Amino acid sequence: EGVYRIMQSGKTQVGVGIHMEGVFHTMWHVTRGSVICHETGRLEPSWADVRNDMISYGGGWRLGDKWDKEEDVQVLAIEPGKNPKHVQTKPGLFKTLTGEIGAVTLDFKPGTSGSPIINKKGKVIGLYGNGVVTKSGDYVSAITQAEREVDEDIFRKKRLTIMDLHPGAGKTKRILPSIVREALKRRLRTLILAPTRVVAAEMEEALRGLPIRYQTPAVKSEHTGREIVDLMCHATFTTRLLSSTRVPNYNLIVMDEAHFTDPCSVAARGYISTRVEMGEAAAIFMTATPPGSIDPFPQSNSPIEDIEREIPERSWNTGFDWITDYQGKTVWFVPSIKAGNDIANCLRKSGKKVIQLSRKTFDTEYPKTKLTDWDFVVTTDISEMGANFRAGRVIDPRRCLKPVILTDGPERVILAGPIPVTPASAAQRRGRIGRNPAQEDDQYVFSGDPLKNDEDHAHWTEAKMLLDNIYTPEGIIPTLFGPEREKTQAIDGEFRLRGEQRKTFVELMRRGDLPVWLSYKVASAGISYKDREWCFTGERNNQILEENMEVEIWTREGEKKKLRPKWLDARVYADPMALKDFKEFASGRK
């Protein structure tokens, strides 16, 4: 501990800070956001205030006391090239409209700012290094100062705890490793569920030193008696529930980003809630936007400037100067990959560096957003799940595409939209910023209002299809999670299959890369997995179009037939990649 100096054609200090209370405290003009090199990792700014010129590195602040009205405050004077020379003074008062705060008049040379000031006796009473020069008076500097691990019941069986954790509340860096630590101390079979693989990797980095075993979906089950915590994705857990009778009866399950509306994730939450009700496990759902929340503008640890204006849907030419004139990094949320490309090109025309993101390109394009410096990141809603960015602005038209099962006539899944996003979605898109403090408040530029009613979303029905197709000790039926239960009127178990149909239904999703609804429609018809004849025997209106032309596929045998599925799912030909995969499937290649 103590008081250290912040140093930079040579080595020379620009300010001073306090290394106490486990935190390092300085001012903005001293650091302007940076890193401090010591054996105790690297210090990063967690909180800041330009209005009062303060920065707290790695947690805090802190500190934090206040001087008496008639107190002789003394100032430490650690200066470049000099020794610490204390100076006792009788402080004054700098009258302001927010209020009058004390101000000492001491002559100190540039680079010594941030030096501690002391109360009558004992602890620190504030920081010195900010003031104003008078034309009459020689000098003055304002006494600057600002105001201002988890429960054990979180492990109790038959209890689900929802932790509304805003980023960054030290969820991944401080909270989760603490929960895993306490779990290991209590000899608990702990399971950790990440939305995506990269998040799981971040967890691995954050859980170094702990017995953590990553679980791949290529493995149906894994076991060791070495008292270890399992770490896997939501979908991995779901598919393991669908493909193995050897699932561990975990007594503590923790799901990160538990707001995920992916069918696998919803089903997962259903099963977990079920196990909790069975009194054999304790659950922890971590999410900034729990299923019982409708706030598009939540509170962040860094100030967010909410701006509302007109946002381009397609390529623009003039009028939107504010988009390109912004000289920081920006995250733009698009409803679809098509719109994403259309925006990305128009952005690159202005000479901007644009990285595009989506579900099938996430694991390969997301690291690019960290290593290389860029100007724009165009993304679908996939970034609402634990995606961290070093940006200052979020552009969010608040529009998305929604899979809907049309039952009017033959059942078919369409992509209704672009449709206004859910309030939770908007909050999560807004949550990409307001993380790390900067002198310029993070800007959330948006358009339109969010819509609550998403009960016609196909993912709920698909989740119901996934849930009741999972074996479990009877008589217990795996139902949807509480808050999400009221979004479908599907009777429990009405999607249950038997034996080979179930196996086919799993293989269609896992090996065929087909959506849940499509896989269910094919499986419950009695069609074998390798049988692809159904991709061609559809109605004339089930013709799939690729770039305004009718698709034609050369079959496995060697015959050309038009791509015309018996059941039409819009998600298999939404983007060229999905259509490529589905064309690979229809050819009997995979």
């Binding site: 103590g2 008081v3 250290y4 100096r5 912040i6 140093m7 930079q8 200090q13 800070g17 306090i18 290394h19 106490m20 390092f24 003009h29 650091t31 940076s34 890193v35 401090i36 090199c37 010591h38 210090l43 330009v50 209005r51 010129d53 003394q74 430490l76 650690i78 020794n83 610490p84 020379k85 204390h86 100076v87 006792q88 003074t89 009788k90 402080p91 004054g92 008062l93 700098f94 009258k95 302001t96 409209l97 927010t98 101000a103 000492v104 008049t105 001491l106 002391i118 006796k121 004992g122 602890k123 620190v124 900010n130 003031g131 104003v132 008078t134 034309k135 008076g137 003055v140 304002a142």
Partner: protein
């Protein structure tokens, strides 16, 4: 590079130090932009 390995002292009070006088009433306009300034 912003290393702060140089630590000179701690939070020690010392009433064997020098004293300098002041205590004026200064009209100050606090800006969210940055620091302080004089009125008019």
């Amino acid at each position: 590079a912003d290393l702060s390995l140089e630590k000179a002292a701690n939070v020690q009070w010392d009433e064997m130090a020098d004293i300098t006088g002041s205590s004026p009433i200064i009209e100050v306009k606090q800006d969210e932009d940055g620091s302080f300034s004089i009125r008019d």
